[PDB]
Amino acid sequence: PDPMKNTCKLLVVADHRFYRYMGRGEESTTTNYLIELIDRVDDIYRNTAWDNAGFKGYGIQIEQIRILKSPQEVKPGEKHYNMAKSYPNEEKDAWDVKMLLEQFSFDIAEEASKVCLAHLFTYQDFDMGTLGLAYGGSPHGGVCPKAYYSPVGKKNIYLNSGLTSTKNYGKTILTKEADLVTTHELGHNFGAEHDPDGLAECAPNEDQGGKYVMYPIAGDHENNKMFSQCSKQSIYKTIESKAQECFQERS
Numbered sequence: 347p348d349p350m351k352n353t354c355k356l357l358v359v360a361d362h363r364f365y366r367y368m369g370r371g372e373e374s375t376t377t378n379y380l381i382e383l384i385d386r387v388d389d390i391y392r393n394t395a396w397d398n399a400g401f402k403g404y405g406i407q408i409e410q411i412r413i414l415k416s417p418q419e420v421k422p423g424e425k426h427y428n429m430a431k432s433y434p435n436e437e438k439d440a441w442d443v444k445m446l447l448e449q450f451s452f453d454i455a456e457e458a459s460k461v462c463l464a465h466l467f468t469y470q471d472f473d474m475g476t477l478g479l480a481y482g483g484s485p486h487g488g489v490c491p492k493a494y495y496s497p498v499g500k501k502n503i504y505l506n507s508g509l510t511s512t513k514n515y516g517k518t519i520l521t522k523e524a525d526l527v528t529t530h531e532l533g534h535n536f537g538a539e540h541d542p543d544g545l546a547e548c549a550p551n552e553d554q555g556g557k558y559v560m561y562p563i564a565g566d567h568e569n570n571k572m573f574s575q576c577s578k579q580s581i582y583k584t585i586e587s588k589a590q591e592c593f594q595e596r597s
């Protein structure tokens with residue numbers, strides 16, 4: 347592992363919802379939450395041996411935190427990931443999650459092109475227990491900006507993005523739960539797909555430690571905070587090539 351290229355630097359964005367509800371309207375509370383969350387997730391990544399040997403030490407580090415203290419004003423018919431209203435149904439607490447991810451990607455394209463990954467942290471209750479979403483590890487996108495021409499958008503956006511909400515079913519999720527979400531979304535970014543039931547090694551029963559982080563259903567069990575051998579094989583396949591493409595030295 348090239349120590350000169352072993353860290354995926356992140357642009358972390360806290361929207362107005364996150365700032366208000368998780369940050370208590372304070373920059374310090376907002377940033378401290380995210381700084382600590384990413385550091386705990388980094389411990390999971392950095393300690394993972396992707397090949398089950400010595401290919402470890404790859405992780406994540408925040409390059410910049412953008413803090414949106416208030417909603418983005420929009421002209422009628424114009425949308426922005428940080429606008430006050432949910433989209434497409436303003437009556438719902440939250441956006442449709444796929445549309446929000448697409449929108450965030452569009453709005454931050456310029457910034458995303460300069461970083462390994464961009465991650466949006468929000469506080470809105472996506473329908474039916476959904477916590478987050480990311481590009482990559484889907485049956486394109488993920489670490490290192492990859493252009494996608496948006497015919498509707500008329501410009502390139504980049505697929506090096508994902509998002510986490512820390513609200514679910516009307517309440518703030520536990521910090522231990524939030525760690526798992528961001529770990530899972532970044533997991534997709536790093537190239538992992540959901541662990542399948544058909545592979546017991548990658549989706550153990552409860553007595554064998556439970557499921558791994560990439561299981562598609564949402565952390566008290568031993569395996570919950572770890573990547574399965576399935577996730578490790580997928581991530582390992584492109585990590586070194588992606589590392590040479592956009593990873594940097596750990597700070």
Ligand SMILES: CC(C)C[C@@H](CC(=O)NO)C(=O)N[C@@H](C(=O)N[C@H](C)C(=O)NCCN)C(C)(C)C
Binds near residue numbers: 476477480561
């Ligand atoms: C384990 C990870 C975080 C899966 C994500 C979705 C995902 O694949 N993100 O890339 C999720 O929200 N999963 C579930 C989840 O556990 N949701 C909440 C917890 C829920 O609905 N719980 C009980 C529902 N009867 C699903 C939403 C799809 C229901």
Ligand SMILES: [Zn+2]
Binds near residue numbers: 530
């Ligand atoms: Zn997933």
